[PDB]
Design a protein around this ligand. Sequence first.
Ligand code: NAG
Length: 218
Amino acid sequence: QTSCDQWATFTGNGYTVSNNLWGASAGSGFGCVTAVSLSGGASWHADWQWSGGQNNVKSYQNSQIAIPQKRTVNSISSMPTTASWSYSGSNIRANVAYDLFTAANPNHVTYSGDYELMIWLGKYGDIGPIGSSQGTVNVGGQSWTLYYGYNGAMQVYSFVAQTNTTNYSGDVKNFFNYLRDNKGYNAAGQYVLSYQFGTECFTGSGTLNVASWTASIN
Ligand SMILES: *[C@@H]1O[C@H](CO)[C@@H](O)[C@H](O)[C@H]1NC(C)=O
């Protein structure tokens, strides 16, 4: 269904579609989300317009999966996902990104973590991820610009596609592994707290169509 309410949510079959206009107060405009299907994955689209607050995120419209039992990264065998999306509109300053928190305590709050992992399939405008570039890295047979920095106590690793990746098939475990193997990341001791995919919107007019998004933790 459709709603333009700041905190609108639609749930079903382990999947949840959320408007999540958490920063709306930082700007002027609106955000509407439509959950088209929640069967065999999530199918949804977000329509929005924002002005003002140039460098502040207005929303993170997204789809995510439930994680009833938290497990360590190393204990998980695979975190497969697929995303099929397109973006249209004008003056778009926004991304298309996976977001995941991990923490050493499985019972940690799920709205923050010790680490934040982001995978930016899309990047529109001059927006930039947290921290600074670490250079190019190969993950899952695709090249990414890896960023690292702190956002408070939390360390954020953002893998940014070098071209907008509108049809994606991947395994988030490959990203945790890269961090494990090259950046001293404690996959042994970190629990996956969240698993979300959406669009951080700053300013402009945009329509994100997510034809399909799937995700699981096995
Ligand atoms: C995504 O596409 C937009 C609009 O064509 C472009 O300006 C931006 O450079 C692209 N980003 C990436 C990561 O290729």
